[PDB]
């Protein structure tokens, strides 16, 4: 019960401005008829480093929805507060597969990782194939200027509320842009 939503410009729509959501857009969309829940991330590769180790990671800032509806389980540590989403603490969450890299057999928690020159402490570790790790998204604004999420779905109350909610839901992001069809689900 979740719809992914896309940013597409049409030809008429570039040539009046020569795939972004807002902070304003992802709390507008909590409020969108049958919106459950808005699942909001901000995706970048980049290298982490902790002492002599060097490894290749995805970094996904994330919003406090996203793993609500994420699956997502800390196997060892502990997960995000809606304090930490807040307040964008420099707090993680790593994929067993980069503790590994980084640490070995050495716990992670409580240490420092170093992603795209920015200090990290490993909270958790995620149930375990990828390196990534998860801080919250009002991190990356401070850490490393980014301001808005790269992909963001919403989450219904039912899957019959799918074709309409998707559709408010685009139309809503459409006029905050000021776009005419740019932001869409699929049809």
Do not use: C
Request: net charge negative; glycine share 10%; no cysteine.
């Amino acid at each position: 019960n979740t719809i992914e939503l896309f940013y597409m410009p049409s030809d008429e729509e570039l040539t009046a401005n020569p795939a972004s959501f807002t902070e304003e857009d992802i709390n507008g969309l909590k409020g969108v008829d049958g919106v459950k829940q808005v699942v909001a991330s901000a995706v970048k590769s980049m290298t982490a480093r902790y002492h002599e180790e060097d490894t290749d990671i995805t970094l996904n800032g994330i919003n406090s929805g996203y793993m609500d509806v994420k699956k997502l389980d800390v196997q060892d540590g502990r997960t995000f507060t809606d304090n930490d989403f807040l307040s964008g603490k420099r707090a993680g969450i790593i994929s067993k597969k980069m503790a590994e890299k980084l640490f070995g057999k050495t716990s992670p928690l409580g240490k420092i990782v170093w992603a795209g020159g920015q200090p990290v402490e490993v909270i958790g570790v995620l149930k375990e194939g990828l390196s990534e790790m998860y801080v919250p998204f009002n991190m990356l604004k401070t850490s490393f200027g980014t301001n808005d999420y790269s992909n963001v779905s919403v989450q219904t109350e039912s899957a019959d509320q799918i074709k309409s909610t998707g559709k408010e839901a685009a139309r809503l992001l459409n006029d905050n842009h000021g776009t005419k069809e740019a932001y869409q689900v699929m049809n």
